[PDB]
């Protein structure tokens, strides 16, 4: 494992510092022994290929570092060599320790401001506690030392240099927790760039502005918006401001900023949607175009489900040919074959409803399947905000309809099976449209968070109780006449009856005309106390507890689903139905850009 | 009782101080009368055998104490004599009152720094509000007077002296509430020890470090860890530290530190498991070895319960020989005798499943019974963290299986009884394995805390309602025909029907074809309002209230169960499956010790 390897790397490194007396002196700063050793090799190297000068820089020993550089000036130019620390210089270490004096002493001796720490200890991963990129300027920026940043720029550090992820220093500053100085650092670096560095993409294709959206950095987003707004006027308490939508609206731009925010895995990303130009833009798009078109699609989908349902109610059946010789058999009707299922006027009316049913199932796969490939399947079905569980059950409904079409054509018996599943999944997928309505939308998120949370834990322990008691009830009744109490007459019936008795959906079995086993009254008293009294009421109690705790996130998730719907509809619908949002600059002399005017009170 | 005796001791002591004028003057500090009495016995003794100098020290009277010591210097050497205060000197009292001047005046006169207050007022018990051990140094330490501690050490107080419990002054400092100075006192005492006193066991076998674990003293534990860590390096925001696991991991050491913490009765002990080297160690042990092996044992136990269940579903039965002459009799099948229960191929397949069933029941007792003797039965079955209620029901299942084996061998009728109990308890004991899974584990603690809490109180008052109403319903129906409403036809049926009606698991009795008693509709209206409407919904309401209050402790108990599982698995499994945790020091030149490297951000 990685942690065991990193640990061994750290232990070997400290051992080699103990073993080699020059490295031991570089750690301890005992200038007497260090003078004797350098008076008496200087290119000696620790376990990771680091020099004695890396050791002196790591332990923050300015004097030992000057002695080492006086005896061997070339050490200031040396990288570390082994896989965790490849390319790390003493300048990366001195910058990270903020030793401005040692940074000057290294730069005065030819330490390379363009050296890149490509080793695995520096990369962005859950393995590493920090990500400062690869260059000393990116370290000084994330460490927050403006005086070291200037000093490195004055020695010719390339401010537009890129990490192995393609990240510039501006991208790396968006990723830091220290947001209180990261914005001050961002201004310092833009002052030396003076194509703008704000427009350089990383290897994901993200500019710094798009990365602040994806990562949910609302502090850096609202800082970046200060150079993308113009105050038109202020009059007493009122201000009118004009925000530039160019990056927010991302017109004709691959994945758009608003797609990148709503499809981000980072739970902070949904907070960008509350920021002034974004909130007013997505609110405008929803109220003017999104809600009207979502109410149309919701209405058309309900009429399509009424059409499919009617084709199941009027499903073609005939009187069975085979006699009911078994007294326990109740089947009286049978499927019509294709050559007899389409004869009357009503059969031709149903053929139209069935062809509409199949046409909608094809159209569902034509809408769904391409979006799997754009978003990636793991995120497409995974993300609550995009509709992930509804994309599973709508593709499953469409598949069950097209399966049933093949069964109808090949005279296959058993259409009740895929039609019963398609009727349940088809109607339950109408809850996809609940996200458009403030009344239904937050509640449909509780249904989801209770299904994959409390209902899941409950069903695991409920299943253990049902297996114990269904077995005790079955063996209690094995010796008794099945005609007098049938609920436990075989193991599959005993399981189903015990499940229905748990949820109190079937009455406890009794027959006062006969003597039931005494072991049944004992077993059912224990069952009624564990299943019905304790666990079925403890389900209500733990749902009530989950409900009050989750109620805020439920609302934040609902307002993010309305934005994700708005972004989906605008992407997928014809552009003539979605006129470009905001104010066109060109007819006011503002050039090709488009704007959002926000008027506000203070 | 103890309190009545202590009270009488205190009253007699004050009476003897009132009665004897030297003790009265030693209490009042009236130097005139005290001079006259000492000018005019001085070995006079209060009810507990204390001298006039103990009285002067108790009332903090420095002047009277100097007058008494000037007239009778030997009083500084005297103990108290009666059972509550045996061996207490005026030096113990003066140290507890922090009278540094009186402590010097006593030590200057030969007061014994090694005297031990062995009386019952000083011992560790719920009877006593303080436990300072027995020696004046242990008093001065717990009282927190560094100047009195030095003064006693300078007069030759043995710092390694032990209380009647075997506790040294270091053990006693772990037991004090005053943790804000107890650590400063701990350093002061280690400075005079300079075998280390940190390694001396008490009569429980606990070193001071193990006692901080058992007592849940997280402040003294994290203080003791400062001399059991080494900082390897710091580089900007990151530090790497190397903790010595020698006492935490307790390799080959009887009860190990981690056993002593998880099996402690003190509800604070589980907080030690959140401390940096312990949390990272038990997290490592769980993720690398504990969770894999617990998922294997959980899977093997579920397959064993499927095997046992199948042996009950395929249980050997034949058509009854005796006729159903009673019209209320429904038994049609009967046990096969041993000599006819094993004839077909399917009976020999079932004999393998039955021998697997019996083999697992023996193995359960071979695993369970020795652990009773290590932990002690009162704690083994009592502790939630160790699995106490599951150890009861798994030993009960194994006993019911071995009972059923004897019944099968001795042709005994009634195997339905122990098999129905073994099927319920056997399957419900699968919830033991819920502690390995973050989804199921905290919820299984709510099931336990609701069973022994809210379900218990509810069942006591529910039973009182059921006895009232089952009796009213039975006597209402005694005069009526049993064939028209059978639910209350005898008292045992009336109790069971009333219990099922309370929980609404059987529908209220009605028969619209006949006139029921008017007293039934009255009694059932009152029953439906008290049982179903009020109490069954008040159960849900009080469980919801318990749920939100207990939800934090439920999570702390779950994370302590994961550690207790980790500690159990490592103890009971073969050592080749559990490679020794942490980093071996020897291959890095650190000697025989083993370490945990923790890398952290600030
Ligand atoms: C999110 C939560 C997910 C939880 C999922 C768990 C679901 C468990 C529910 C039930 C599964 C079993 C369905 C019926 C199978 C037996 C039908 C049958 O064929 O029975 C028997 C044969 O087999 C058996 O003896 C059953 C053996 C016991 C199996 C119990 C289930 C095992 C797996 C359960 C899951 C384990 C983990 C649970 C959680 C820890 C057929 O005999 P008979 O009854 O026809 O006649 C009576 C007997 N003569 C023929 C002699 C007259
Ligand atoms: C955690 C909570 C724990 C709570 C535990 C409490 C459980 C109480 C539940 C019930 C226990 C009694 C079970 C049935 C016994 C009668 C069967 C029988 O034999 O009845 C009778 C004989 O006796 C009786 O008259 C019963 C007398 C009343 C006893 C009531 C229970 C007493 C103890 C209850 C607990 C006290 C404390 C409660 C809480 C404060 C048999 O007459 P018969 O009915 O056949 O015919 C009808 C009558 N001829 C024969 C004339 C036709
Ligand atoms: C025998 C068939 C009918 C069984 C297996 C069918 C299961 C269906 C009814 C279950 C499977 C998953 C369930 C499910 C998945 C996820 C969600 C999203 C949530 O925000 C609203 C409820 C909803 C929509 C529910 C509805 C009911 C579903 C669709
Ligand atoms: C309690 C939780 C775990 C939920 C999910 C499980 C419920 C179980 C008990 C239910 C779900 C579907 C049920 C079920 C499906 C279909 C049949 C076929 C029928 O001819 C006999 C009953 C039988 C065999 C029952 C057995 C009990 C089952 C398997
Ligand atoms: C007639 C028989 C079948 C009656 C008496 C049997 C009672 C059983 C079902 C009861 C007795 C004590 C109960 C019990 C004890 C303690 C715990 C630990 C808790 O964390 C989970 C539930 C669990 C596991 C429950 C399950 C149900 C048990 C085991
Ligand atoms: C309400 C709480 C206190 C729970 C624990 C108690 C329930 C009582 C009412 C239940 C538990 C088991 C039941 C019970 C066990 C078995 C039998 C034998 C049967 O031939 C007649 C009913 C009879 C006699 C009933 C009477 C009512 C009992 C004793
Ligand atoms: Cl689960 C679910 C999901 C979506 C709707 C859509 O709900 C709206 C009505 N509504 C409800 C609340 N506020 C408005 C609706 C109903 C019927 C028809 Cl035909 C069209 C529409 Cl638009 C209803 C349930
Ligand atoms: Cl009450 C109870 C206790 C333990 C399990 C063990 O649950 C796991 C599944 N699980 C559940 C949650 N997260 C994972 C499991 C199921 C079946 C089999 Cl055969 C093996 C295993 Cl490991 C299930 C109920």
Curated annotation (Swiss-Prot), chains A, B:
Chain spans, region Interaction with S100A10: 563-567
Residues bearing attached sugar chains per UniProt: 323
Its placement in the membrane is given as: Multi-pass membrane protein
Annotated GO biological processes are: calcium ion homeostasis; calcium ion import across plasma membrane; calcium ion transmembrane transport; calcium ion transport; protein homotetramerization; regulation of urine volume
Q: Where are the ANK repeats?
A: 17-44, 48-77, 86-115, 132-161, 165-194, 204-233
Instruction: Write out the residues that bind Ca(2+).
Output: 507
Q: From which domain of life does this come?
A: Eukaryota
What Gene Ontology terms describe where this protein resides (cellular component)?
Answer: apical plasma membrane; plasma membrane
Family to which this protein belongs:
Belongs to the transient receptor (TC 1.A.4) family. TrpV subfamily. TRPV5 sub-subfamily.
Q: How does it assemble?
A: Homotetramer. Probably forms heterotetramers with TRPV6. Interacts with TRPV6. Interacts with S100A10 and probably with the ANAX2-S100A10 heterotetramer. The interaction with S100A10 is required for the trafficking to the plasma membrane. Interacts with calmodulin. Interacts with BSPRY, which results in its inactivation.
Q: What is this protein called?
A: Transient receptor potential cation channel subfamily V member 5
Its ancestry begins with:
Eukaryota, Metazoa, Chordata, Craniata, Vertebrata
